[PDB]
């Protein structure tokens, strides 16, 4: 279960990861396709996990 969609859909995230390997380092082009910030798709993928809980 991954049902908790925000601005990024599981398709958009899979697509950024698809384009990530397919382009290599062209995060600008990835975000430009997705209609998102290049910096934000790069940071989202870099984090990989997400600490949703405080503790």
UniProtKB/Swiss-Prot annotation:
Q: Would you say which domain of life the source belongs to?
A: Eukaryota
The record's tissue-specificity note reads: Expressed at relatively low levels in colonic mucosa, ovary, peripheral leukocytes, prostate and small intestine, and at higher levels in spleen, testis and thymus. Expressed in multiple regions of the brain and CNS including amygdala, caudate, corpus callosum, hippocampus, substantia nigra and subthalamic nucleus. Isoform 1 is the predominant isoform in monocytes, macrophages and neutrophils, isoform 2 is most strongly expressed in peripheral blood leukocytes and quiescent CD34 positive cells, and isoform 3 is expressed at low levels in all hematopoietic cell types.
Myb-like domain mapped to chain residues: 6-44
What is the annotated localization of this protein?
Nucleus
Q: How is it modified after translation?
A: Phosphorylated by the cyclin-D2/CDK4, cyclin-D3/CDK4 and cyclin-D2/CDK6 complexes and to a lesser extent by the cyclin-D1/CDK4 complex.
Known role:
Transcriptional activator which activates the CDKN2A/ARF locus in response to Ras-Raf signaling, thereby promoting p53/TP53-dependent growth arrest. Binds to the consensus sequence 5'-CCCG[GT]ATGT-3'. Isoform 1 may cooperate with MYB to activate transcription of the ANPEP gene. Isoform 2 may antagonize transcriptional activation by isoform 1.
| Oligomer status and interactors | Interacts with the D-type cyclins CCND1, CCND2 and CCND3. Interaction with D-type cyclins may modulate transcriptional activation by this protein.
Similarity comment: family membership: Belongs to the DMTF1 family.
Protein's UniProt name: Cyclin-D-binding Myb-like transcription factor 1
Q: Which organism is it from?
A: Homo sapiens
Portion of the parent chain present: 220 to 274 of 760
């Amino acid at each position: 279960d991954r049902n908790h969609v925000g601005k990024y859909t599981p398709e958009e995230i899979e697509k950024l990861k698809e384009l990530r390997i397919k382009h290599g380092n062209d995060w600008a082009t990835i975000g430009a396709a997705l209609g998102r910030s290049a910096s934000s798709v790069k940071d989202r993928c870099r984090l990989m996990k997400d600490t949703c809980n405080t503790g």
